[PDB]
Design a protein around this nucleic acid. Structure first.
Ligand SMILES: [Mg+2]
Lengths: 54, 178, 97, 429, 180, 52
RNA sequence: UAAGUGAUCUAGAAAG
């Protein structure tokens, strides 16, 4: 479930090894973003080809 | 109603304090709160938060809490079913990880009570960190939880219990006595 | 709004806009006396942890005294006082190695 | 490719989510954790200092910055406060930007548009202690307790993140319902209200309940912290009440004591499910958006009361962390039971598992329902449910869950029982 | 440059708040200090001495108006808060002057350096911020003195020194101290 | 100091930042005025005598 | 040795 998923993600982030250490300047960057218009800019030919693979 | 007509524990605590019930009834209130906590399916931070708020507020409330605790492990612990008991233990652990002083009064006394104790220990571990927790325990007088004196293989039982729920220092203690 | 804390306006809100100050607030404020325990523990954990100039100063003082004395008693001329002062300085130097 | 493969595992035995066959492999690459959610990707990069510097340099080369306008035009999370939100250090800010740029470069714009206005980059460092991000409607602030000043009493809303090896509650993660979700909720409320000049008060009430239940069951723990959401709830609830009062062409506050709304339908009331009688956290709005915060001065909440404490739906919903922990427990227990049965040679009875019956995720009871064989073939169902939004006019407000695969994740009969009590008992009503 | 630090006498300070030989005499009258110190002294705003050994022989330490200018800057903008210094002595211990002499560098260098030295001295001497205190007068009626007392208690620094009875009237002219 | 909003309306232009259309308040003397309720005439009752 | 004082929106009639 989405909340469950979120929780899992959080756990993972905590459970990454040496993730919170900042002694040697270990900079962790969390990037989040939307893939904008990802549905709106599929070409059908390419899509078809991709499908053919699977 | 107050407990349940309140978003965070903090709010609930505030509401309770508004009432300004006599130093007589504080214990009763605490008991009620505990019961409520037990009733909920699993341990909630809310109740713990409320307790903390109460505890900070006044010495009488602290006293009441202590009394309640005493009542529990002594006379009211064996009555509860397992999940409820576990929840209670967790709550107590939370209370004790920070707010309370580690003061604890613990062969014969081992069914429900032992499991409650185990639960509490687990909670403590979760909150603190194992070695740190151990250190903290050492710092307080603590004769009941970990009796230091060998006392003719009476500590063996305790060691066994500890082993049953992943823990350290027991072995060391055993070594010490021989 | 009272101490920056009340709800800006009673309208809209859809509520009384009443404001009980909390008694958790007090608790939050207070545990530096009662957090305090933690601090104490921390403290416990980390709890265990020129002569030449003086001489010079003394010499200076002595010189000053000498000067004062000179001023007091027959030393309108500079050479005398200066001489005596110099001698004193020399003596001081001798005394300190 | 290689990184992706690593993430997957081997084909013969692939990894579970965010697990790796070794630690060394995990360490090797800069990226650590990935998850796309429904075309909203989440990448956790973990750099060393040297690595970071190079990236920064590259970024600078790409796009010179003499006046220092990288902190300006940078997506930071306004919901959080200025201290706890991502601090704008000339290293950290630059690093995030560089990362974003790199990511952009990696995909052609023609295939998909990865905009800076869409994106967010939190950066954990020596100078930034709050790893922030918005997932699924939650806003999560992961703040390690080693970085935290005084490791205060765990609040409600906060998930204590746990280290799986040592079992230590090693970090905290504070939650807030993301503003978008709040907005959505508001919209829903409006919809409910609008197009309801007729409706049987009761229908409206039911709708409201449904809305409210969806809101609360989705973010149980994460409501408490967000004050805006609370405010909206208060307002929304009031609006709903007034709708009913609009029908009765009055809204005189005495003529509708909470009795008539919250009393269940089984005593003739509307049977609303309030989340409004909460004393909302007020705070120094001077120091709230700015800097740091604490819960002081409660605001009114919703109504004049006759000291009638109407219980609140939240206290009858088990906060998400608790639920997850419970799930972890009882699934293990279930497994153990199964093992025991196997050892003894038996079919595991549903009467023995009673006690942990309505407890877990999925609810234990999802095993022993009398129509399970077919739902095992319904795979890729959650996604389908989610995508329902685009097929249907009025959608499900409980897209996130699904009763058949999960079991009832909430139960609110207790609440019903207690509301009556709160309202004096039956006689009073 | 090496400069020392030590607080002046409280009474002396108070006096200050409210010809070399003459100055020396005055100093003696005030605190009963040594005469050499008095001779060397040359203060502003607080106290600045020139009390090493070799300065009386040396001509580098002689002509110290420019030097004292530098010190003034230090006094203006101290070490702790970049906020002004108060109730402090500054006696020189030794001065690292090179053989090569140029008027542009010698003075300019001293200017920063003196300030730095002062700061160092302050650091050494167990520095402390001094806040001011308002002297207060309140003129309550008779029966509200307890209220006033309570208020005072509630504020951090506070002292009711004396509750002077304003004759022929209800008023209790209460002298006070409260930090600004 | 907590800077109470009591203090805002007392020294508006100071304690409050960006005050607008704010009028200036008064800042007064104390009123020692004693009225006899027991039907007596010119008496130092509530206060105390001079030293000399 | 010191908790617990106060902040309380509303408010109906016509036609459609
Ligand atoms: Mg018409």
């Amino acid at each position: 479930i989405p909340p469950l998923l979120v929780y899992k993600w959080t756990q993972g982030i905590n459970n990454l090894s040496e993730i919170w250490d900042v002694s040697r300047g270990q900079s962790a960057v969390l990037l989040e973003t939307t893939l904008g218009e990802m549905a709106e800019k599929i070409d059908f030919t390419l899509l078809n080809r991709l499908l053919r693979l699977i | 109603l107050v407990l349940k007509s309140s978003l965070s524990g903090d709010e609930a605590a505030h509401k309770l304090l508004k009432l300004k019930i006599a130093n007589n009834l504080k214990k009763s209130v605490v008991d009620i709160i505990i019961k409520s906590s037990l009733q909920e399916s699993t341990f909630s931070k809310f109740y713990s938060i409320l307790s903390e708020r109460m505890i900070t507020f006044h010495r009488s409330w602290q006293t009441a809490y202590n009394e309640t605790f005493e009542q529990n492990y002594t006379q009211d612990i064996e009555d509860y079913e397992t999940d409820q008991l576990r929840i209670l233990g967790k709550f107590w652990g939370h209370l004790i990880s920070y707010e309370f002083l580690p003061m604890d009064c613990l062969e014969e006394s081992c069914p429900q009570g032992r499991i409650f104790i185990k639960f509490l220990f687990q909670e403590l571990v979760n909150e603190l960190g194992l070695d740190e927790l151990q250190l903290r325990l050492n710092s307080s007088k603590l004769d009941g939880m970990f009796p230091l004196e060998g006392d003719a293989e009476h500590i063996r039982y305790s060691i066994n219990f500890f082993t049953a729920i992943g823990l350290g220092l027991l072995t060391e203690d055993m070594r010490s006595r021989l | 709004s009272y101490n920056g804390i009340g709800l800006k306006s009673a309208k809209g809100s859809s509520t009384s806009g009443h404001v009980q100050r909390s008694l958790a607030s007090n608790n939050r404020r207070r545990p530096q006396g009662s957090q305090q325990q933690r601090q104490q523990r921390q403290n416990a954990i980390k709890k265990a942890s020129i002569e030449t100039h003086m001489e010079k100063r003394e010499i200076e003082v002595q010189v000053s005294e000498l000067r004062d004395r000179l001023e007091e008693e027959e030393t309108l001329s500079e050479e005398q006082i200066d001489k005596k002062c110099e001698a004193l300085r020399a003596k001081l130097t001798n005394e300190w190695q | 490719q290689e990184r992706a493969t690593d993430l997957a595992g081997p084909a013969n035995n692939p990894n579970e989510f965010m697990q790796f066959k070794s630690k060394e492999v995990e360490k090797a690459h800069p990226i650590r954790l990935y998850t796309r959610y429904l075309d909203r990707i989440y990448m956790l990069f973990h750099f060393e200092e040297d690595e970071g510097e190079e990236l920064t340099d590259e970024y600078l080369a790409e796009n010179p910055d003499p006046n220092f306008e990288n902190s300006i035009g940078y997506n930071n999370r306004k919901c959080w406060p200025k201290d706890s939100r991502m601090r704008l250090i000339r290293q950290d800010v630059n690093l995030g930007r560089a990362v974003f740029w790199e990511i952009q470069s990696r995909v052609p714009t023609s295939l998909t548009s990865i905009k800076w206005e869409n994106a967010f980059v939190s950066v954990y460092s020596k100078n930034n202690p709050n790893l922030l991000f918005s997932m699924c409607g939650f806003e999560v602030r992961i703040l390690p307790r080693q970085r935290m000043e005084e490791v205060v009493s765990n609040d409600e809303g906060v998930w204590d993140l746990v280290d799986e090896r040592t079992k230590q509650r090693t970090a905290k993660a504070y939650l807030k319902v993301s503003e978008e979700e709040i907005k959505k909720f508001d919209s829903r409320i409006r919809g409910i209200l609008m197009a309801s000049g007729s409706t049987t008060f009761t229908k409206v009430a039911a709708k409201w309940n449904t809305s409210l239940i969806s809101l609360f069951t989705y973010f149980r723990e994460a409501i408490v912290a967000t004050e805006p959401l609370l405010d909206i709830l208060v307002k929304g609830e009031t609006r709903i009440q007034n709708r009913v009062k609009l029908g009765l062409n009055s809204k005189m506050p005495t003529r509708f004591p909470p009795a008539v709304f919250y009393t269940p339908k089984e005593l003739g009331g509307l049977g609303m499910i309030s989340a409004s009688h909460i004393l909302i956290p007020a705070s120094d709005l001077s120091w709230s958006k700015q800097t740091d915060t604490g819960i002081t001065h409660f605001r009114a909440g919703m109504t004049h009361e006759d000291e009638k404490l109407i219980p609140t739906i939240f206290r009858y919903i088990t906060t998400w962390e608790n639920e997850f922990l419970d799930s972890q427990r009882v699934w293990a227990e279930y497994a153990t039971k199964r093992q025991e049965a196997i050892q003894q040679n038996r079919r595991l009875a549903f009467e023995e598992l009673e006690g942990s019956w309505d407890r877990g995720i999925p609810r234990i009871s999802t095993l022993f329902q009398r129509d399970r064989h077919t739902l095992a073939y319904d795979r890729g169902h959650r996604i389908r449910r989610e995508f329902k939004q685009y097929s249907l006019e009025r959608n499900s407000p409980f897209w996130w869950t699904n009763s058949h695969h999960d079991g009832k994740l909430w139960n609110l009969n207790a609440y019903r029982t207690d509301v009556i009590q709160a309202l004096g008992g039956i006689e009073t009503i | 440059i090496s400069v020392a630090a030590e607080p002046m006498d409280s009474k002396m300070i108070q006096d200050l708040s409210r010809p070399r030989k003459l100055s020396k005499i005055l100093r003696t009258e005030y605190g009963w200090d040594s005469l050499a110190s008095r001779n060397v002294w040359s203060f502003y705003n607080l106290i600045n001495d020139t009390l090493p050994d070799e300065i009386s022989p040396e001509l580098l330490s002689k002509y110290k108006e420019q030097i004292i200018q530098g010190f003034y800057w230090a006094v203006k903008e101290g070490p702790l808060a970049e906020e002004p210094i108060y109730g402090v002595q500054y006696k020189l211990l030794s001065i690292s002057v090179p053989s090569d002499v140029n008027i542009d560098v010698m003075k300019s260098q001293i200017i920063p350096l003196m300030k730095k030295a002062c700061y160092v001295g302050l650091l050494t001497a167990i520095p402390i911020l001094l806040e001011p205190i308002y002297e207060v007068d309140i003129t309550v009626h008779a029966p509200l003195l307890p209220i006033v007392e309570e208020l005072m208690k509630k504020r951090r620094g506070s002292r009711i020194y004396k509750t002077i009875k304003v004759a022929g009237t209800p008023l209790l002219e209460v002298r006070g101290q409260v930090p600004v | 100091v907590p800077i109470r909003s009591e203090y805002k309306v007392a020294f508006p232009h100071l304690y409050n930042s960006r005050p607008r259309s704010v009028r200036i308040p008064w800042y007064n003397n104390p009123v020692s005025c004693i009225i006899q309720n027991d039907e007596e005439y010119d008496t130092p009752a509530l206060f105390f005598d001079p030293s000399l």
